[PDB]
Amino acid sequence: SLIDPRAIIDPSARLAADVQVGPWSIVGAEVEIGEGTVIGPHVVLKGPTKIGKHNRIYQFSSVGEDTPDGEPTRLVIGDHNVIREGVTIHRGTVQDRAETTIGDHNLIMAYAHIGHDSVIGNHCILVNNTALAGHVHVDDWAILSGYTLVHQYCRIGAHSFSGMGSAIGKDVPAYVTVFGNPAEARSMNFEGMRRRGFSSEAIHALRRAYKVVYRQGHTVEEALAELAESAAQFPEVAVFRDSIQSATRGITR
Amino acid sequence: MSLIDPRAIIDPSARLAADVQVGPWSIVGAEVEIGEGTVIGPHVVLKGPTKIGKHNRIYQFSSVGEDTPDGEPTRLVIGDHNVIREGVTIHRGTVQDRAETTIGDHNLIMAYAHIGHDSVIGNHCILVNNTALAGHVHVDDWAILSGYTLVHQYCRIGAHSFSGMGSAIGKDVPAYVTVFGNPAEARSMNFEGMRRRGFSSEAIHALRRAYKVVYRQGHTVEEALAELAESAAQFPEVAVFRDSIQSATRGITR
Amino acid sequence: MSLIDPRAIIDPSARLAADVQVGPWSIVGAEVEIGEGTVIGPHVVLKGPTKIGKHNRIYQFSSVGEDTPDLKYKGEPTRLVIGDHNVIREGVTIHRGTVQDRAETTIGDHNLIMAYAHIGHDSVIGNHCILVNNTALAGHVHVDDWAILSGYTLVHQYCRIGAHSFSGMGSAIGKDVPAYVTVFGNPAEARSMNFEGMRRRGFSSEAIHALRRAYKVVYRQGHTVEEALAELAESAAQFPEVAVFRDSIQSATRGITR
Ligand SMILES: N#Cc1ccc(CN(Cc2nnc(N)o2)C(=O)CSc2ccccc2Cl)cc1
Ligand SMILES: N#Cc1ccc(CN(Cc2nnc(N)o2)C(=O)CSc2ccccc2Cl)cc1
Ligand SMILES: N#Cc1ccc(CN(Cc2nnc(N)o2)C(=O)CSc2ccccc2Cl)cc1
Ligand SMILES: [Cl-]
Ligand SMILES: [Cl-]
Ligand SMILES: [Cl-]
Ligand SMILES: [Cl-]
Ligand SMILES: [Cl-]
Ligand SMILES: [Cl-]
């Protein structure tokens, strides 16, 4: 039996035929689970929530809860995600998007917290006890090391990196490496660029870009103007320029 | 359908008010008392001697009323209208201290927060995710401890005080004071909280002056306490600030 | 009052000593071996290949013996070995090793692993250690005997935590911690030595005196690690405790916490 007889499946929950649900797990009202998803034992799923295909949800996780902070609120999870033990994921709020969104191929490790209205892209890694306070946007390939704490409304750029125990209060531009409490910009995620097979011309253009923004005494407005030529030439320097441009809380330094 | 789920384990000695709800696979241990309107979620472990009041809400994977990992009976007393989120750990007292861990009313204890043995939480406190109270910690009314605040043993957290995220508090936090970092450092006062509480402009103004007296005028704790005496008799809110510095045994956060 | 609760799941490949206690809604997975006098609480997940020794106590919501989620691991027959008289509190996560290292996570005897602590792949814990609430060992972390890691201590991969060392609450350890050294903050900084622990253990005043002197040689006299190790050589020959300290600086591959 794919659905263990000790599991609780709410009559309003919609499941694909091959979904697996472990013992003592609760698939609450308005939960939707897609093809090939494996729900481990002792899992609490609450809705309105959509869980896509080939996901893996480990024991003691509480996914789709109401934020502790009849309003129609939602949580949407994509495909091929791994949600480890004790992870807490809250649904969105009417006083925003009404949605917490998680894309594809993400790895959300033990006791990580995804606050209401957060948006996670694809291929992200949120290491043990990473906490997103709420309204946090995490772009593609970002890595947040163990116990990274993220202030509300913060944007974590594409391929960015945070060291363990970092406390992020400002936006992290794309590819930037950040460390400490409060978080400070240190360098670019060159190891990340190598894993993805970026060209030597692109890696050099990104190293040049970091210096314009952080190591040349330029203001945000001064740096953005100087980056315009490199961003037009390289689509990845454009990813860097855009994350600085769209920063609301200022950039991490 | 049934208020007490048939899959839950309820010890014969536990005392539950008629309308108490217990979710599936929860354990309500011996000598655990639960008051009217309380909702115990699924997968909850409740150990005693413990008294839980009225209209509380306890979420899944919480362990409430456990013995300390660090024999006369030791209690855990929880008040009314509290919210205890998932994976919260609350230990009972130790006979060598007060033999009781106490939590008042209208508290919000968020996911994975830890309340060490012999800790006392007042009313209307917010303990954000993973806040940890090492033991013998006193948290006075309306305190806000942001995500992952670590509080050293025997520390006192003043009324209406605030800690920033990831704060590591080794010293007493006076009432109203905002603390940040590891190690925690005093920054200002939570004037925002005062206004939400309906404090008068005059009370707020006297507290602002009280902060300056303690932290920005080079006074010793003794000189500061004598200078605050006058304003403290005029305003009960300044007497609260002055009393928290007077009661400091680990010194104040600077 | 059956020792194995009827609501618990015992895989038929699991090997248990006859007096093993297993609480309701606990899972004793495939290839899990449990020794005499061990008590498994309710709501515990045990996965293998795992050996759990004698007189252990494993609390509710713990996940012991899982695979590391780390992208480098690929379903290998890796192990977790836990010794005797250990206490694993509620919500603790312990992962098995990886073939890329020595394919084993090892925990010795008389350890206290407090609530929500994390023991990453290929970590080695000795004896009489205390890992306070939410301490996290990223992976390949070696914790020698009698170390105390205070609440929310974070340890970088491959770090070595020396015997009788101490970390303050919220420490972020990125380099090796020599034996007896006390470290605080993010990033961790060396402060002094755990003289309190040395006294509790019954070290002679002569040994304590020579350890205090050894700390100054390494940290307070502006010497290099090579110079410091040559200067400590004779004190190390007369005091096993100084040899323990000297060895921890010798074996440091990530540099020592300064
Ligand atoms: N898949 C993967 C993956 C990728 C990057 C990281 C980032 N990273 C370094 C690292 N790389 N491999 C490991 N195990 O750790 C940390 O977060 C260390 S801190 C930590 C680590 C684990 C647990 C608790 C804590 Cl506190 C971590 C895992
Ligand atoms: N009810 C409430 C309430 C009141 C004050 C706070 C204080 N606060 C800022 C904030 N306000 N609303 C939200 N969600 O966060 C934090 O603790 C941020 S850190 C954090 C936040 C949430 C989770 C994990 C972490 Cl680490 C938080 C919640
Ligand atoms: N058995 C034991 C034992 C030995 C040393 C320690 C080291 N220690 C000081 C201390 N001693 N007794 C208590 N309760 O705390 C801390 O880790 C403080 S931080 C903390 C503490 C507890 C929970 C969460 C946090 Cl964050 C802790 C426990
Ligand atoms: Cl066998
Ligand atoms: Cl054995
Ligand atoms: Cl990676
Ligand atoms: Cl514990
Ligand atoms: Cl400490
Ligand atoms: Cl001493």
**Length in residues, chain A:** 253
Give the Cα separation of A86 and A66 in Å (integer): 16
- Collect all residues of chain A within an 8 Å Cβ-Cβ radius of residue B43: 24, 42, 44, 60
C contact test, residue of B5, B26, B27, B129 with most C CBs within 10 A: B27
**Length in residues, chain B:** 254
Among the candidates B139, B164, B188, a domain finishes at: B188
Among the candidates A152, A187, A222, a domain finishes at: A187
At C226, which helix (H) or strand (E)?
helix C225-238
Closest to B66 in 3D by CA, of B92, B44, B85: B92
DSSP for B158-176, written as a single string:
-TT-EE-TT-EE-SBB-TT
Q: What's this structure's resolution in Å?
A: 1.9
Number of C-beta neighbours around residue C85 at 10 A: 18
- Do both B135 and B252 map to the same domain? no
- Write the DSSP symbol of residue C248: H
What are the φ/ψ torsions at residue B139 (nearest 5 degrees)?
-115, 110
* C138, C161 contact by CB (below 8 A): no
Closest to B28 in 3D by CA, of B7, A187, A135: B7
**Length in residues, chain C:** 258
- Do both A92 and A146 map to the same domain? yes
Question: Ligand 2, from B142, B146, B167: best to mutate by most atoms within 8 Å of Cβ?
Answer: B146
- Do both B207 and B169 map to the same domain? no
A68 and B61 within 8 Å at the Cβ level: the answer is no
At A49, which helix (H) or strand (E)?
strand A49-51
- Do both C162 and C46 map to the same domain? yes
Among the candidates B145, B162, B188, a domain finishes at: B188
- Write the DSSP symbol of residue A66: P
Nearest Cβ partner of C45 from A59, A109, A129? A59
Q: How many CA atoms lie within 13 A of A231 on its CB side?
A: 18
**Sheet containing B21-22: order of strands:** B21-22, B39-40, B57-58, B83-84, B108-109, B126-127, B144-145, B162-163, B177-180, B185-189
Give the Cα separation of C178 and C258 in Å (integer): 10
Question: Ligand 1, from C72, C157, C186, C254: best to mutate by most atoms within 8 Å of Cβ?
Answer: C157
* B186, B203 contact by CB (below 8 A): no
CA distances from residue C21 to B184, C1, C30 in whole angstroms, order as listed: 44, 10, 17
Closest to B107 in 3D by CA, of B74, B136, B145: B145
- Do both C147 and C216 map to the same domain? no
Total structural domains within chain A: 2
* A141, A196 contact by CB (below 8 A): yes
- Do both B196 and B161 map to the same domain? no
In the reported structure, the alpha carbon of residue C113 is separated from the centroid of ligand 1 by a whole-number distance in angstroms of 20
* C256, C225 contact by CB (below 8 A): yes
Give residues after which chain A gaps, C-N over 2.5 angstroms. 69
In the reported structure, the alpha carbon of residue C195 is separated from the centroid of ligand 9 by a whole-number distance in angstroms of 6
- Do both B53 and B174 map to the same domain? yes
* C163, C176 contact by CB (below 8 A): no
- Do both B210 and B121 map to the same domain? no
Closest to A86 in 3D by CA, of B31, B244, C161, C60: C60
Q: Annotated catalytic residue: which of C139, C162, C168, C197?
A: C139
Type of residue found at C21:
Q
- Do both A110 and A229 map to the same domain? no
Which pair of tokens denotes residue C95? 């992962």
Give the Cα separation of A89 and A114 in Å (integer): 5
- Do both B115 and B233 map to the same domain? no
- Residues with Cβ within 8 Å of B16's Cβ and at least 6 positions away in sequence, in order, are B4, B10, B22, B28, B33, B34
- Do both A170 and A233 map to the same domain? no
Which numbered atom of ligand 1 lies nearest the CA of A143? Answer: 5
> Domain range holding A32?
1-187
A42 and C25 within 8 Å at the Cβ level: the answer is yes
- Do both A172 and A215 map to the same domain? no
- Write the DSSP symbol of residue B230: H
In the reported structure, the alpha carbon of residue C146 is separated from the centroid of ligand 8 by a whole-number distance in angstroms of 17
Give the Cα separation of B125 and B107 in Å (integer): 5
Q: Which residue's CA is the nearest one to ligand 3's atom 7?
A: C150
Closest to A115 in 3D by CA, of A69, A83, A80: A69
Give the Cα separation of C204 and B225 in Å (integer): 46
- Write the DSSP symbol of residue B226: H
